[PDB]
Design an enzyme around this catalytic site. Structure first.
Site, mmCIF file in Angstrom:
data_model
loop_
_atom_site.group_PDB
_atom_site.id
_atom_site.type_symbol
_atom_site.label_atom_id
_atom_site.label_comp_id
_atom_site.label_asym_id
_atom_site.label_seq_id
_atom_site.Cartn_x
_atom_site.Cartn_y
_atom_site.Cartn_z
ATOM 1 C CD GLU A 11 40.661 20.081 3.992
ATOM 2 O OE1 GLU A 11 39.591 19.347 3.999
ATOM 3 O OE2 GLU A 11 41.597 19.936 3.204
ATOM 4 C CG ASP A 20 36.953 12.613 1.438
ATOM 5 O OD1 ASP A 20 36.627 12.179 0.243
ATOM 6 O OD2 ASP A 20 37.998 12.305 1.978
#
Length: 164
Positions: A11, A20
């Protein structure tokens, strides 16, 4: 290699509000703030989350704090979930890390939706499950991380991260 180092790898770490892969507003280690376009909606969510006025900028300590909460919530969610729990209990420790990974990134709801895959893993049918898991929007959207998770499932080793 443990779950925290595995997810940090997948991540990444960002100290400022960011978007994102899916357009959504995020911070630190994979922490979704809001699926809504207001960056101003996101700064609010953020402040609520840290308990101070931040802007879109947090410290590492803050992000780790977020991280610790998120991993905790992921585990507890799995153990409370009727679909998730039996798969988790059936698995060895590495593979259990692979399921936490999925849950942390896609939510409880999303993973539970992978019915057939879940049944194959429960049946310890590794190669089959790995093939079924690749047949998803998830894999197609982020192939390198999905392949890493999927290899962990297939093998039971931390080979994909050993990279890394």
């Amino acid at each position: 290699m443990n779950i925290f180092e595995m997810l940090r790898i997948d991540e990444g770490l960002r100290l400022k509000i960011y978007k994102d892969t899916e357009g959504y507003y995020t911070i630190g280690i994979g922490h979704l703030l809001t699926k809504s376009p207001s960056l101003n909606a996101a700064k609010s969510e953020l402040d609520k989350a840290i308990g101070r006025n931040c802007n879109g900028v947090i410290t590492k300590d803050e992000a780790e704090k977020l991280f610790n909460q998120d991993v905790d919530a992921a585990v507890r969610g799995i153990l409370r979930n009727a679909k998730l729990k039996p798969v988790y209990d059936s698995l060895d420790a590495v593979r259990r890390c692979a399921l936490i990974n999925m849950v942390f990134g896609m939510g409880e709801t999303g993973v539970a939706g992978f019915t057939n895959s879940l049944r194959m893993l429960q049946q310890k049918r590794w190669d089959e499950a790995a093939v079924n898991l690749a047949k998803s929007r998830w894999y197609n959207q982020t192939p390198n991380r999905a392949k890493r998770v999927i290899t962990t499932f297939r093998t039971g080793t931390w080979d994909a991260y050993k990279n890394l």
